Design a protein around this ligand. Structure first.
Ligand SMILES: Cl/C(=C\n1cncn1)c1ccc(Cl)cc1Cl
Ligand SMILES: Cl/C(=C\n1cncn1)c1ccc(Cl)cc1Cl
Ligand SMILES: Cl/C(=C\n1cncn1)c1ccc(Cl)cc1Cl
Ligand SMILES: Cl/C(=C\n1cncn1)c1ccc(Cl)cc1Cl
Ligand SMILES: Cl/C(=C\n1cncn1)c1ccc(Cl)cc1Cl
Ligand SMILES: CC(=O)N[C@@H]1[C@@H](O)[C@H](O)[C@@H](CO)O[C@H]1O
Ligand SMILES: CC(=O)N[C@@H]1[C@@H](O)[C@H](O)[C@@H](CO)O[C@H]1O
Ligand SMILES: CC(=O)N[C@@H]1[C@@H](O)[C@H](O)[C@@H](CO)O[C@H]1O
Ligand SMILES: CC(=O)N[C@@H]1[C@@H](O)[C@H](O)[C@@H](CO)O[C@H]1O
Ligand SMILES: CC(=O)N[C@@H]1[C@@H](O)[C@H](O)[C@@H](CO)O[C@H]1O
Ligand SMILES: CCCCCCCC
Ligand SMILES: CCCCCCCC
Ligand SMILES: CCCCCCCC
Ligand SMILES: CCCCCCCC
Ligand SMILES: CCCCCCCC
Ligand SMILES: CCCCCCCC
Ligand SMILES: CCCCCCCC
Ligand SMILES: CCCCCCCC
Ligand SMILES: CCCCCCCC
Ligand SMILES: CCCCCCCC
Ligand SMILES: CCCCCCCC
Ligand SMILES: CCCCCCCC
Ligand SMILES: CCCCCCCC
Ligand SMILES: CCCCCCCC
Ligand SMILES: CCCCCCCC
Ligand SMILES: CCCCCC
Ligand SMILES: CCCCCC
Ligand SMILES: CCCCCC
Ligand SMILES: CCCCCC
Ligand SMILES: CCCCCC
Ligand SMILES: CCCCCC
Ligand SMILES: CCCCCC
Ligand SMILES: CCCCCC
Ligand SMILES: CCCCCC
Ligand SMILES: CCCCCC
Ligand SMILES: CCCCCC
Ligand SMILES: CCCCCC
Ligand SMILES: CCCCCC
Ligand SMILES: CCCCCC
Ligand SMILES: CCCCCC
Ligand SMILES: CCCCCC
Ligand SMILES: CCCCCC
Ligand SMILES: [Cl-]
Lengths: 334, 334, 334, 334, 334
């Protein structure tokens, strides 16, 4: 029996190695396999990865006439001491178990141990949509010991920044992913003390040009279309009136359709400001002709008892104001 | 073996400490990690937190030449007595178990015990949408002992209002969160007796200005647009008629689009009252011109065999009535 | 050890109390905590409740110098006999287990037993939507023994109609709930025999006035709007034609929007009949003017080589027919 | 102890009854409780049922002074041999376990056994939507032994066609259900051999008249509406043009709305053919007037330097072609 | 007892067969039962299959007077050594367990073993939608040993390309499936070494003709409809203007409706390019008439103080440009 080469019943494996003395160092490496999904309304993401641990325990040393190591599956985990890592700020997680538990232990003759398992985790990520669609988001995954303070267990990245590897074809459908790196920081709990925490950081971006074509283009086109009435004969009322009202209807169907396709986030974003300002422009172009038609009728009635000046000024004033608004908007939102 | 320092087989751990006598006090602290989601149709919310217990048991005392405590994981829980807390009015819950069970026990030399675990819970919350979007909601989470009355177990907040801590970046996508505090109250069951219950309370609010721009603005604009026809020559029938009917169509597409984007709650809310009143105003503006055109045709036919008075009065009467409705509405709904 | 006061190893707890003789009576009480959700497409509902059992077993009697009872958690259930209740016509269910199993047993000195647990269940409910939105639905939850016929186990409500209690704030978002009561009935299985079954019954209703404002109001308004053309000068073709076609478009957008918001039930309901009849009325008003314009052109051409009679009759005939349809419809559907 | 009446430790219950000799016959009965849901996109359905087995084992015989049988719950299943049935072509399944495992065993004095359990299963069903909404679908559920060939275990329906019972109120929301019956057939696996398989078959149909009113009615009405322009004075251009373009818009909103409400199946179905043909008819009616107006203008200009023949022919030709298309369509698709 | 024919307690089944020496070969066969679902947004698919293993172990040999083998269920798996296969790049998986665990073991007298189980797996698949709806996708499922390198375990397809079988009625609702085959490749891990990996490959395609009718047809029809105004009398302003604006509205409702029905993938696809170009064409046709009407009014006013040339050129220039765009587009995207 291989479990008799390790004197399992001769030691108390409910206490850590080096109990009573300096803290035992534990090194960690991570390999990220994929990014599975992201939820903008609930503000979280899901990832699948491999987690590896490295430490030394003299109680597991065994004699050997060679330098070969012994390998075990997850059934041995319940008989020895192992570190208790958990994921901070997570919502759910599980360990894969097909066709059996995805766990491995390798023991060197001198007592060095490698501990490897495959896991899937869902973690929270606070997001800010004020600058949508030109927003940038930063996310992280955090690892910590549940019950051991820094006086008993010292947790660190085994090879610094070389301890993190990512798959060559990692991707998300609606985002671009960049800038993976690691950091560390100490955390304080009033109930028990100080703990060391490890982080994995990355950044997300959208495809701007899609949103530009999809949203900003049609609104600008309809605003330019509403200016055509300034060049039409003012005597053609049955042509001037339906044009304006139909332009208003069209802008409304555009805005409704654009709403239906964005994530349901109930506060003001940049693209709403652009859309609503454009709608106000279309509205004012209808009031302009109402004033022209009333003044012309008044003059004709007075007389019985050429281009109007308002059209001449509007032809210049409307585009300049729209250009100025665009300059200010794009200087503010980049 | 550390489990031999506690005389586990020398006591009956199916009975509480102090059995036969006064009730044993149990103190509680809570740390809230995040708010995960909220469902308006099903009327519930989900939260993740840390739950800590504190009590004393002389049967767990052990000799020591120092003042160091002993720490255990969840495997010891099945060998000793622990309190049986459950969440009242909950729909589902679970205890996190990656990479192992997220449970800890710490025992002092004199028998003081700390019991800590990490849990996620979904709880009901009755909501009232009568004043939407200007509504305010209050929610709570409740903690109680399943099997012990106040004569056997006395449950209380360990440090009063200082027993509740919340994470600095707690947030929801569509709500603002304020005013966390704790309370206590006694509850009666006819089957078994009196129990003490603990509460955690908080309040939610919406972003009003978003809904104002999104809903109230376009309806007011279309109502003002329908008044333009009062200043148009009454002889231009092919201009007057299509304007009114197209305004009605536009208001209808607005209302349908607004419905499609609100939570599916099938009873009357304030924003429906505003929308429907606006639609009635647009409808009456079309009936006005129908009457004008009939009367003018009658006069002309009679004669063969200037502004009409109705337009002159409507130009004044319609805006005043709308302003009065707005005053009453906003005095009622704040 | 408290489990030595009951002679657990001196009896066979795989057989019922009173084996060999008359059936053992078992009384039941129920406390309903909440109604969690309802699904109209799948035709089911979900509820959370407390279930309590009461029976006597002389094998559990123990000596005592007082009249105090002993209390146990779920770990004792596997050592003694307990009744095997299940829910008939259910789709899924589970027993709550945070922070431990929500089960309790209380044993009197003379052998009386109380057995209490907390459970959540999803059950089927056949619904009929023919009269929507004026429909009424009735639902039930059923309880039965899996393996014991009425010759071995007699199941009954412990206190008649007083055995059912409901929470003071039970509610659903889209329904009104009334008329809770209990009944009993015997059921026959050809495989094994007769069993007694218990029922919990209640009734659901909708908020009619919401649906009236939301659906019936706009359709009636558009039907009345289509009658305006009967009072317009027949010589104004470019006013008469676009009015009718735009009214048809508006009614179509209303019907599409109303469909998008009802539960996806693919058979004919009352509100469809009202909507479709209204659409036919709008369609006939356009055919009326087509006939008028053709006849007028024919007369003018014939002559070269006042109000038309059709308008005069339509002005009377259309509203009377619509009023008659409304009388018949509302006498049929209440 | 009742488990000592059966000599459990005197036999090897890892081998079947009659090992070494002819195959042991096993009879099956099924009672269907409900049909829970159906998914058209994923092509599967879900059902809840009772499954009963019947066989004889002389090793379970026990002495008795009467003819009474002994009943056990699921805990005895792990101590004796039982048949290993599984569901072929299923996606998920589970056995109900509230308030305990829904399993029963009944043993006669002579060794006859009844084995009963309650289960829910989701199974695949390939569907063909070519004839939608006039399609018909056939589904089945299949039962088979996992590890025993027909040489060791003989599986059959216990009472032929009388072995299948269905609940009196079984129903689905969007389908009609008819024609339950059973069959059997032998299956071959190259890895191990021949196995006998049992089937349960049934058929589904839709409510045609709903779809007729919902889809075919409005399209026919708009096609008939487009024919009105053939009777309108050709000199009234501002009446003829907007009518046609608005009819095209209305047909487009109808088709979009109809798409939004059908299951997302991305290939051509019959109702698409009808809709698209109707749209082509509306399109050609606009080209007709374009040609009329150009020819009239040419004639007038030529002259300066009554009904047109095209209208007269169109008034006859358009309805006849539409009627012929309808005859062919409904002779093809029934 | 059959488990005494195999000397289970006389061997250490924590080490592989042939420990210390050359690697043990393990052959694999796969039978695919169904394809359950596919998710385009999350980029994964789900499949149900049978997995079979074949190897030899002299420790399991037993005496026999015949050539009959012994069969066991999953309970024996925990007592002997078996291979530890897992699925690479998977998101979740499970082993079916109704009515018991779907596992089988068959042992020959000479120690040959067959190991069979039924499993369902969800696996990732990166997709590219640039050419939608004319895109083609390739997917794979991968199998690998968790803990044994190629020096200890040699994994291979048992019968080459004949080791893969697929069900005769495998299908997906929205895709066509072709070209199943197998491959193998060696993989390197810096943590432990080289491993052999097996692949199952297949290809997916869409139904093009559906998308052609659904999207490309209406846009082309509306572009052709906008050309009608070039043949209309330029003096009929109240006919020319509403036609153009209504055509713009119709194209907008078409594009919105087409968006609502495609998978929510936020980057530019081919069908967007076609739609947006068509919209620009419709927009330019309105600017054309605006210029014509202004120039005509200028000429008339100048004079007071036939076909216009622009119409004559547009009648030729617009269709040629559209045909050229179509030629380039369909030469690029096939
Ligand atoms: Cl965006 C919208 C209407 N909604 C459509 N879906 C939900 N709300 C709107 C908001 C502001 C303005 Cl100025 C115009 C419009 Cl049309
Ligand atoms: Cl809100 C709606 C129609 N619906 C749109 N989606 C669902 N119902 C409506 C209700 C009342 C009035 Cl006066 C006008 C309208 Cl347009
Ligand atoms: Cl209700 C509908 C169209 N649909 C909208 N969504 C789904 N179908 C309709 C049915 C009958 C009649 Cl007469 C008119 C109409 Cl517009
Ligand atoms: Cl059915 C559709 C547009 N879509 C709406 N939703 C998705 N596609 C269509 C197809 C063919 C024809 Cl000839 C006309 C139309 Cl409007
Ligand atoms: Cl596709 C769309 C609007 N959207 C509808 N749903 C979501 N966005 C659009 C994009 C570009 C152009 Cl040139 C015209 C239009 Cl109408
Ligand atoms: C401990 C350490 O070396 N940290 C660095 C971090 O400071 C740097 O930002 C990153 C690349 O950006 O590489 C890593
Ligand atoms: C027991 C106790 O001190 N309760 C108070 C509560 O009365 C008060 O409302 C809250 C702050 O609002 O702080 C806490
Ligand atoms: C056994 C019994 O008393 N049943 C009654 C039932 O008949 C009655 O309908 C209900 C109130 O409606 O109260 C209860
Ligand atoms: C074995 C047997 O009797 N099978 C029949 C089947 O042939 C028949 O089609 C069905 C009723 O349709 O009843 C059953
Ligand atoms: C090992 C082997 O024979 N592989 C082949 C593969 O090369 C070929 O592409 C496929 C059919 O396409 O059949 C198999
Ligand atoms: C905080 C931004 C407000 C923008 C208002 C736009 C009004 C058209
Ligand atoms: C009409 C669009 C104007 C865009 C100007 C952009 C200035 C950065
Ligand atoms: C980061 C993209 C900015 C786009 C500017 C557009 C100005 C019209
Ligand atoms: C209880 C509020 C009713 C509001 C009716 C509005 C009618 C336009
Ligand atoms: C036309 C909008 C009027 C708003 C008045 C507000 C009174 C509080
Ligand atoms: C709490 C916001 C009230 C808004 C009043 C608006 C009156 C037009
Ligand atoms: C069974 C009700 C049929 C109603 C048809 C309505 C036609 C407009
Ligand atoms: C035009 C609506 C008529 C409603 C009449 C109601 C008769 C009960
Ligand atoms: C139960 C409500 C009946 C409503 C009748 C309305 C008649 C116009
Ligand atoms: C295979 C059916 C094609 C139908 C094309 C319809 C074109 C209007
Ligand atoms: C205009 C509809 C014609 C329907 C004819 C039906 C022939 C079976
Ligand atoms: C099975 C129903 C056929 C319907 C024929 C309708 C012909 C207009
Ligand atoms: C990369 C493709 C851009 C297409 C732009 C289309 C503008 C109408
Ligand atoms: C107007 C459609 C033109 C299609 C041309 C196709 C060239 C391959
Ligand atoms: C693979 C299909 C190509 C379709 C070409 C259509 C050109 C109008
Ligand atoms: C649109 C502005 C009109 C100005 C009237 C004085
Ligand atoms: C909306 C009316 C405008 C009048 C300007 C004199
Ligand atoms: C744009 C407003 C013009 C007013 C000139 C009198
Ligand atoms: C948030 C203010 C934006 C201003 C754009 C002109
Ligand atoms: C719109 C009101 C008309 C009044 C006719 C007497
Ligand atoms: C709708 C008709 C109005 C007539 C008023 C005299
Ligand atoms: C607003 C109604 C006006 C009526 C004047 C006769
Ligand atoms: C709308 C009915 C017309 C009658 C023609 C005889
Ligand atoms: C639709 C044409 C009507 C003709 C009546 C004479
Ligand atoms: C409503 C139909 C009127 C016909 C009178 C000739
Ligand atoms: C609509 C067909 C027109 C025929 C021109 C020759
Ligand atoms: C679309 C133009 C039609 C011209 C027929 C002569
Ligand atoms: C329907 C086409 C008619 C053509 C007659 C010249
Ligand atoms: C549409 C192009 C107009 C050209 C004016 C010079
Ligand atoms: C949009 C105005 C066009 C003017 C060309 C001269
Ligand atoms: C299509 C542009 C035509 C311009 C001819 C002057
Ligand atoms: C991506 C460029 C497409 C060009 C089509 C003409
Ligand atoms: Cl006109």
């Amino acid at each position: 029996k291989s479990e008799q080469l390790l004197r399992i019943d001769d030691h108390d494996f409910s206490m850590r190695p080096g109990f009573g003395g300096p803290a035992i160092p534990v090194g960690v490496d991570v390999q990220v396999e994929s990014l599975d999904s992201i939820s903008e309304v609930d503000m979280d993401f899901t990832m699948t990865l491999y987690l590896r641990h490295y430490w030394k325990d003299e109680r597991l040393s065994f004699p050997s006439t060679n330098n070969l190591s012994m390998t075990f599956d997850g059934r041995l985990v319940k008989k020895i001491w192992v570190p208790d890592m958990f994921f901070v700020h997570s919502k759910r997680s599980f360990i894969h178990d097909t066709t059996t538990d995805n766990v491995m232990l390798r023991v060197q003759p001198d007592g060095k141990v490698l501990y490897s398992l495959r896991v899937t985790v869902t973690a929270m990520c606070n997001m800010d949509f004020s600058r949508f669609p030109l927003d940038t988001q930063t996310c992280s995954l955090e690892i910590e010991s549940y019950a051991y303070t820094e006086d008993d267990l010292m947790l660190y990245w085994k090879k610094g920044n070389d301890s993190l590897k990512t798959d060559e074809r990692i991707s998300l459908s609606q985002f671009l992913i960049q800038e993976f790196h690691t950091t560390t920081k100490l955390a304080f709990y009033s109930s028990t003390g100080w703990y060391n925490r490890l982080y994995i950081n990355f950044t997300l971006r959208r495809h701007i040009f899609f949103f530009l074509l999809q949203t900003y283009f049609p609104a600008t086109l309809m605003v330019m279309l509403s200016w055509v009435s300034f060049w039409i004969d003012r005597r053609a009322v049955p042509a001037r009136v339906p044009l304006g009202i139909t332009t208003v209807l069209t802008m409304s169907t555009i805005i409704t359709g654009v709403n239906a396709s964005m994530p349901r986030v109930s506060y003001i974003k940049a693209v709403d400001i652009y859309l609503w300002v454009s709608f106000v422009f279309v509205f004012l172009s209808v009031l302009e002709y109402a004033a022209v038609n009333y003044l012309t009728t008044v003059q004709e009635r007075k007389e019985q008892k050429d281009t109007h000046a308002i059209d001449k000024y509007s032809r210049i004033i409307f585009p300049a104001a729209y250009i100025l608004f665009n300059l200010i908007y794009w200087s503010i939102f980049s």
